[PDB]
Amino acid sequence: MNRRVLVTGATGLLGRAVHKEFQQNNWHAVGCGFRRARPKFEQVNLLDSNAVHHIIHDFQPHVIVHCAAERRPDVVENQPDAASQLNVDASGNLAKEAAAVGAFLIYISSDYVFDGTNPPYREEDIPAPLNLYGKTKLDGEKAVLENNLGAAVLRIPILYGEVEKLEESAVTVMFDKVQFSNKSANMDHWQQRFPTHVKDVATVCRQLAEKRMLDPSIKGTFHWSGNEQMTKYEMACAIADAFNLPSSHLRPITDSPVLGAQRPRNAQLDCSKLETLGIGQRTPFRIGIKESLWPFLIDKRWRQTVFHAENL
Amino acid sequence: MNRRVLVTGATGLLGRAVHKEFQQNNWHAVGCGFRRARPKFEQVNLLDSNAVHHIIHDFQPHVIVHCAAERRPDVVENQPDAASQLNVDASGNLAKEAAAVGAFLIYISSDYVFDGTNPPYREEDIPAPLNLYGKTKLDGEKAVLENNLGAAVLRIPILYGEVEKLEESAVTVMFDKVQFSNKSANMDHWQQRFPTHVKDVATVCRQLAEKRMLDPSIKGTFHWSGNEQMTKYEMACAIADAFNLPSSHLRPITDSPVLGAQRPRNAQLDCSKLETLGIGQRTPFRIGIKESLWPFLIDKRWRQTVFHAENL
Ligand SMILES: NC(=O)c1ccc[n+]([C@@H]2O[C@H](COP(=O)([O-])OP(=O)(O)OC[C@H]3O[C@@H](n4cnc5c(N)ncnc54)[C@H](OP(=O)(O)O)[C@@H]3O)[C@@H](O)[C@H]2O)c1
Ligand SMILES: NC(=O)c1ccc[n+]([C@@H]2O[C@H](COP(=O)([O-])OP(=O)(O)OC[C@H]3O[C@@H](n4cnc5c(N)ncnc54)[C@H](OP(=O)(O)O)[C@@H]3O)[C@@H](O)[C@H]2O)c1
Ligand SMILES: Oc1ccc(/C=C/c2cc(O)cc(O)c2)cc1
Ligand SMILES: Oc1ccc(/C=C/c2cc(O)cc(O)c2)cc1
Ligand SMILES: Oc1ccc(/C=C/c2cc(O)cc(O)c2)cc1
Ligand SMILES: Oc1ccc(/C=C/c2cc(O)cc(O)c2)cc1
């Protein structure tokens, strides 16, 4: 489309895919990053209200896709006031600036706003976050929707895609456990997950934006999710199957974990609202994960002691 | 050549170029990294003696080019025992393992081992480091040459090349000062520097390795440097000239700085020993820097307030 789009968090796992989607569909796509921004992207600290103000009013975007967030529970628990400032305050300020320029803001939220006791969750179901991250994401939605009426909230589950490091994604972190066949690996078989490709969420954003460019009623809360239900165990096995690797060493743990009280068992998102717009894309997990992980597939060759016990 | 080469610090500024040089010249090049290793390279902590031992004896390299180091004076001063462990202890252990496999080790050193009072410095001139970094690099040479007789030390000056971030290189960090023409910039015109392209140091490593594969006398201390003498000011102006940008805003400071007592004024390296082997390559600074920085050249376009005073 002949429109301008600004993508916050363009250096991140989802942001990279959102920027690619828009750009490849001939939008004037401008991406934002921070530590990893330059040279590919704009270096804008979302915590600096003036920088945010200046790039938005200079670029004059039609759409703003807000991906930038603190999603790491290690940083959200250790630095709770820095997490709130980025996941809540920065989003709210972005909504104020989106409103001033007349830009359609898409706030990216999480399935972690729900307690995962009563799936599937419809957009207008009561959120009950069991962790501070979900609470910051929930308070982020409230901040966005308070300061910008026409904004949209897109709730999505566990993401995977082309990663810079295996730790960039909760699905991709377990690749090494699957590759070290000599050592038994304990894998969660309790929490129900819906692995979603960032490529597919990026399509949903572009489509939603493109719908809004013709229909002013495209606003509010939306849910997007992959339709393949999987536990971390089933995922680990699916990864093994994709690469034709053994999964005999992988042990399922059906029991609720120690931190299980702070994690939603099944926060399944009902996607009927978006499906009502004809919006959506679903890359089969076995295809998507193979695309994502093949560079990290260790070719032993000369590496005789690489799979050694005291190495990871 | 039909030989195997292991490059430590392959993720770093110099390491990336050394690995490319060897690989492009049909060597069996295997690169090592740490935080940025995967998927392109091997993840080996040089501080873990077992990991170092295992990769060296598995790969059985003919040559080892040791680039990995703590070169940041901010980390060398704040964490002096972690800097010594990597710049000294890890190098020495690498020399012990190079010796055990019968691999030609090239230790990359610095012009900062000299006090820069009596240039040009010949390889057998007395080193006198004015800072802890230079002292760790000097003690690194001693560690290497003590534990491996046949090893080579390659002393090089200020490096530049294709950077991931402008901060990756002391030459490239000043690009933003050169680009912000609206603000006057104070540039050092005291310390004499010899900006050297990593591409050119990488050629010198390959050539030295290839010479050693036929001549067992290729060992000891060597010096490599670009032949263009420049102060940070002259460099900043040369960068401006390369891109056809004004340099009127750039102010030279001929006076010795506050930290000037800890920096060698002119640690010019005499390269006659390598020139005696027919070794060397010299990319003209104006060509080399243009290749290195063009991705970081800001195209204003819609970015009206990007060059604003309260932004950098
Ligand atoms: N990852 C999942 O599994 C998943 C599941 C549901 C929803 N989400 C939601 O998805 C959204 C997307 O993020 P992600 O998963 O792709 O996370 P991400 O990989 O962690 O990336 C985070 C992004 O935040 C940017 N950022 C952080 N601080 C910034 C600052 N001060 N100024 C400007 N930018 C800053 C980063 O920039 P630099 O790196 O350049 O510094 C990076 O681009 C998030 O809102 C998240 O809550 C995550
Ligand atoms: N840069 C200059 O201007 C210049 C001038 C003269 C000589 N030097 C000398 O040139 C050599 C090359 O380095 P550089 O300038 O290219 O520096 P660099 O960019 O700082 O890169 C340092 C490298 O060190 C690796 N490393 C650090 N800790 C490690 C560990 N614990 N295990 C394995 N690898 C580790 C890094 O890996 P990860 O990033 O993957 O973690 C990175 O590859 C250095 O020895 C330096 O002293 C520098
Ligand atoms: O390595 C990692 C650190 C944190 C995360 C976040 C995972 C996640 C999973 C969901 O169902 C919803 C959500 O908002 C976030 C993933 C990988
Ligand atoms: O304590 C340890 C025991 C074994 C190892 C194996 C290391 C290793 C790392 C590589 O990238 C390739 C390889 O062939 C071997 C490391 C540490
Ligand atoms: O951003 C930076 C932090 C540290 C450095 C190191 C510079 C340097 C310059 C020399 O003449 C010799 C040397 O060993 C190192 C460069 C850039
Ligand atoms: O305090 C401040 C005053 C001005 C600015 C300018 C920001 C900016 C950043 C971009 O990547 C593009 C742009 O057009 C403008 C930032 C902070």
Numbering used by the authors:
A (entry chain B), B (entry chain B): 27 to 338
Excerpt from the paper describing this PDB structure:
MAT (methionine adenosyltransferase, also known as S-adenosylmethionine synthetase; EC 2.5.1.6) is the only known enzyme that synthesizes SAM (S-adenosylmethionine), the principle methyl group donor and precursor for polyamine and glutathione synthesis. MAT2B was proposed to modulate the catalytic activity of MAT2A by lowering its Km value for its substrate Met and the Ki value for its product SAM.
Minor structural variations between the two structures are found in a loop region of the second domain (residues 282–289, loop C), forming an extended coil in the hMAT2Bresv structure and a two-turn helix in the MAT2Bsubt structure. The MAT2Bresv structure reveals two bound resveratrol molecules (res1 and res2) per protomer, which exhibit different binding modes to the protein (spheres). Res2 slots into a narrow pocket that is formed by the C-terminal residues of one protomer (A), as well as the loop L1–helix α2 region of the adjacent NCS (non-crystallographic symmetry)-related protomer (B) within the asymmetric unit. Res2 is positioned within the hMAT2Bresv dimer interface mainly by van der Waals contacts and hydrogen bonds with two acidic residues (Glu68 and Asp84). The hMAT2Bresv structure did reveal a head-to-tail dimeric packing for the two NCS-related protomers within the asymmetric unit, but it probably represents a crystallization artefact for the following reasons: (i) the C-terminus involved at the interface is partly derived from the vector-encoded sequence (AENL; residues 335–338), (ii) no equivalent dimerization is observed in the hMAT2Bsubt crystal lattice, and (iii) size-exclusion chromatography of full-length hMAT2B does not reveal a dimeric species in solution.
